[PDB]
Amino acid sequence: SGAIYVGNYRVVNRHLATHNDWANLVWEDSSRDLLVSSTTAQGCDTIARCDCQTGVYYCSSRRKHYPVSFSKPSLIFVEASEYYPARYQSHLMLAVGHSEPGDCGGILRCQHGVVGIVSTGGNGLVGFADVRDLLWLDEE
Numbered sequence: 001s002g003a004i005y006v007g008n009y010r011v012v013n014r015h016l017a018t019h020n021d022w023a024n025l026v027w028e029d030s031s032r033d034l035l036v037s038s039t040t041a042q043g044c045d046t047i048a049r050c051d052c053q054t055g056v057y058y059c060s061s062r063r064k065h066y067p068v069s070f071s072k073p074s075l076i077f078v079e080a081s082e083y084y085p086a087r088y089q090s091h092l093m094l095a096v097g098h099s100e101p102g103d104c105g106g107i108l109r110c111q112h113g114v115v116g117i118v119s120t121g122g123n124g125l126v127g128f129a130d131v132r133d134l135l136w137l138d139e140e
């Protein structure tokens with residue numbers, strides 16, 4: 001589990017969004033496994049606006065923060081899980097690291113701010129859903 005709180009927005013894995021997230025939906029994309037809902041309180045997170053490929057992610061299944069190198073956001077085939085059939089997931093970045101399904105929501109961050117959230121994994125590779133291209137998260 002995990003979310004990003006920026007301005008009056010809440011960014012979560014679409015497969016983990018609650019009833020209240022759907023009732024207060026701002027934007028969602030199934031192919032990215034992302035959902036954004038509105039909040040009443042101001043958040044404190046800063047979204048990175050960069051093209052970094054090195055950062056640190058939180059892995060709840062190890063209670064550890066791991067420094068990693070990750071690939072640029074791309075369209076990648078992702079095998080079936082309990083939440084989606086096998087399909088191409090877009091805006092996805094991979095690193096060599098440990099992950100389990102319950103690690104989804106763990107934040108990946110660089111020197112500039114939040115880069116994305118854990119979304120996929122297996123075979124010793126963890127996948128993160130990028131959020132750096134959602135420029136609208138910073139305004140209004």
Ligand SMILES: Cn1nc(C(=O)NCCc2cocn2)c2cccnc21
Pocket residue numbers: 015033078079080081082083084089099100101102103104118119120121122126127
């Ligand atoms: C971090 N991670 N996530 C999952 C997972 O099942 N995600 C469900 C969401 C999803 C995205 O595309 C397809 N399903 C996973 C499975 C093994 C190891 N690490 C994993």
Ligand SMILES: [Zn+2]
Pocket residue numbers: 048049050051052110111112113
């Ligand atoms: Zn950066």
